[PDB]
Symmetry: C5
Subunit: 56 residues, 5 copies
Amino acid sequence: SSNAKFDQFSSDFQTFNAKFDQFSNDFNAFRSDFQAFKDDFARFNQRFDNFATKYR
Amino acid sequence: SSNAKFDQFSSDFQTFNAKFDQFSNDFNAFRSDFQAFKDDFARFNQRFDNFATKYR
Amino acid sequence: SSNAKFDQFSSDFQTFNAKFDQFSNDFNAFRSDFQAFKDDFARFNQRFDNFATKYR
Amino acid sequence: SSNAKFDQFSSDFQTFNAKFDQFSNDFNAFRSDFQAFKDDFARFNQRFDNFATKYR
Amino acid sequence: SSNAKFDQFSSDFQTFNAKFDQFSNDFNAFRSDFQAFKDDFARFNQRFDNFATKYR
């Protein structure tokens, strides 16, 4: 192909690489959010077990 | 390779790049929904703690 | 480069593009499942709220 | 480009295509885990409702 | 098009490929977090069943 056409594609690919990098960071922020929920659920589970034992 | 073939692929790539932006947007909408659920759960956990601690 | 090897790459990219579309659909189907769950969690939280108020 | 550079790229793309397919299968496996969880939650929700009803 | 420009694209694609492998690992780690959460929920569900049974 012409250099001009290839350069358009390579810079387009660079935009995609940047978008993917952002999505990867977004996904990891979601993972952090999910871990925070999981730990909050663990705290609930322990509080429940405590209550259910005392009120069994 | 040749121009006509390359131009077609460059177009196909750009269509994929646009679809990737829409997926990234879909994932962020999901992240907001998930955070909403996580905070709703956090609210529930605090109400459960109040019931179990302050009223039992 | 060889037109014929480029033809293979173009086809393999089309295959990737279709698989990406399948994944994007699957992700959006997952979002619908997450929405059903989030709604179900709301059902529970609101039921618990009522219960707690009556048993405070 | 030269055929050698292109052919290396095409081989690298085929490897990425295979990894993407793997990820899409991983994502679909997750969707099964999520649906199983959603169903477990709907069953908890019914059992909570039954408890709250019988305990009026 | 030129070998120099192709070499730059090939480098960018290799970097994307590596990022994708990282993301796929991150997704698998999330899947593991999710399964552990699902099992935690099942453990709660059993605790709640045992508690509710004793209030009949």
